Amino acid sequence: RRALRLGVNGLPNSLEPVNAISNVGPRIVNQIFDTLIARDFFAKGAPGNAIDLVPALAESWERIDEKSVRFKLRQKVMFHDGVELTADDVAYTFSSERLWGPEAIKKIPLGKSYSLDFDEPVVEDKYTVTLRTKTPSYLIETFVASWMSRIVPKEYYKKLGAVDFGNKPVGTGPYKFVEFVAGDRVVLEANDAYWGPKPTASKITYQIVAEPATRVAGLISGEYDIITTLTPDDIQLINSYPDLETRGTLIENFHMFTFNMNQEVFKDKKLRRALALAVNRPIMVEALWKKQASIPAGFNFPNYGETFDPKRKAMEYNVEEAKRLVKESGYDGTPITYHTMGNYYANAMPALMMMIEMWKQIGVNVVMKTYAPGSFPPDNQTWMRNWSNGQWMTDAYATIVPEFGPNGQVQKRWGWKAPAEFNELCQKVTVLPNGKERFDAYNRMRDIFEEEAPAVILYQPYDVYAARKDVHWKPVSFEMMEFRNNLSFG
Numbered sequence: 001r002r003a004l005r006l007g008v009n010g011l012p013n014s015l016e017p018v019n020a021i022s023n024v025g026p027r028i029v030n031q032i033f034d035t036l037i038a039r040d041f042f043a044k045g046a047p048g049n050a051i052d053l054v055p056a057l058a059e060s061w062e063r064i065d066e067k068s069v070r071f072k073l074r075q076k077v078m079f080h081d082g083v084e085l086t087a088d089d090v091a092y093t094f095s096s097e098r099l100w101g102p103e104a105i106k107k108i109p110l111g112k113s114y115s116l117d118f119d120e121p122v123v124e125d126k127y128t129v130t131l132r133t134k135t136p137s138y139l140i141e142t143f144v145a146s147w148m149s150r151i152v153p154k155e156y157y158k159k160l161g162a163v164d165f166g167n168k169p170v171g172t173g174p175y176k177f178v179e180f181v182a183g184d185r186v187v188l189e190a191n192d193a194y195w196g197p198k199p200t201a202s203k204i205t206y207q208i209v210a211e212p213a214t215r216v217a218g219l220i221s222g223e224y225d226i227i228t229t230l231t232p233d234d235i236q237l238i239n240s241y242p243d244l245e246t247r248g249t250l251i252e253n254f255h256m257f258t259f260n261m262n263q264e265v266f267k268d269k270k271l272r273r274a275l276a277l278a279v280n281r282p283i284m285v286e287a288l289w290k291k292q293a294s295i296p297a298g299f300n301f302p303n304y305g306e307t308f309d310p311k312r313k314a315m316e317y318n319v320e321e322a323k324r325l326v327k328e329s330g331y332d333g334t335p336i337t338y339h340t341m342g343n344y345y346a347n348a349m350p351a352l353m354m355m356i357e358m359w360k361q362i363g364v365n366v367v368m369k370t371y372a373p374g375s376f377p378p379d380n381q382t383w384m385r386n387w388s389n390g391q392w393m394t395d396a397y398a399t400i401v402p403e404f405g406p407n408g409q410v411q412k413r414w415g416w417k418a419p420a421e422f423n424e425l426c427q428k429v430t431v432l433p434n435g436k437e438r439f440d441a442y443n444r445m446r447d448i449f450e451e452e453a454p455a456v457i458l459y460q461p462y463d464v465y466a467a468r469k470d471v472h473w474k475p476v477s478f479e480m481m482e483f484r485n486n487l488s489f490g
Ligand SMILES: CC(C)OP(=O)(O)O[C@@H]1[C@@H](O)[C@@H](O)CO[C@H]1O
Pocket: 021, 022, 023, 024, 253, 387, 388, 389, 390, 391, 399, 403, 479
């Protein structure tokens, strides 16, 4: 077997699966760990976008009532160190101690904010575990299939603690941990004791190449088998090589810009709305995305299933209203900083360049401020910044409620004073089953989100990868890389 060489845009701060939730972490943690339920993106000849949920660590499951799901676990599944996976490891993964409890905030900072209203799991036997919520939740199944639910070994994790575990991870996944050199690489090796489809690569290296041009030239040399986070502008050149090709897809993620609402200038919605209303998304999608990216009609995505609104109108573009809103606001022409980690996000810097020009035209002077990976400045030194949200549920709950909800980081850390109505509907949607009331509540939340502008949705990026033709791997409609039955050589 060949050793897989990946030229990536970035690396996560940790390999602890919840702390690895980013654009850069899932592509690694998906190799080290498994979930109870997994998604088959390639079901029924789909091009890496199938919504099909299949058994993984749980061979079967059954919803008992409105707040509990019993899982029958796959037997004799071994962790990388030889310890057998039991219901105890599953219970610990979803425990108050490790995940959603008050003390857990020091280990997994976003654990509670991203979790459901969990109640302590129930271990029925060695291979039977019931996951439960304190209040009704029809989201247990989707949460279990998500990036929040990768199963950790209880004894090893507790022995090391969350911080040391994130630097020496042990999972059940197809690839085991070899090395993690921060700001350089993550090396993994084949787990030949894997319960599922056998690893096809002997080794996997995720090498940071922050500059996309250095990344492209890296594949042409070729120092890499696959390179990530490209732009549709890189397409024609890579494809001009007979042994190289681009591989891309629209992913279940949106790019955005957001605000530090603790800053005087961003406390009121006026300037935030003015900046939102001047964003010309169709020109950005032509100039930088060559029609490949997509513009959602608000905080509304097809993956939401029953909570997606297909009748919803597009987000407003109104330069004249934006101009008036700048005039009415307290803003005085003082340069506003916009923080970006270079091109961590595809087209981050070219996108900002276009917006600075759009904003200059409405009377807002915006300045780019670059920061190195891991060198993000203190919160009060930042005003505007770019971000992305992976839509991780087959439901509208994620990410409006975990990110923008009353217990979320946009309101708590970033100072968004959300209207009472918004927070009230967030509570109803978490608890209500699907229906007219729930559908309408999500639509009213979407209306408040656009009126308030705590963040401004830009587009669903078209995720562009490039690879050696002799490396057979197909992208998935999510911000991760899948190698299970989706990696071979020659
Ligand atoms: C830099 C990082 C933490 O942000 P990123 O856009 O890579 O990851 C987000 C994550 O913060 C969370 O909002 C869920 O979606 C991810 O894309």
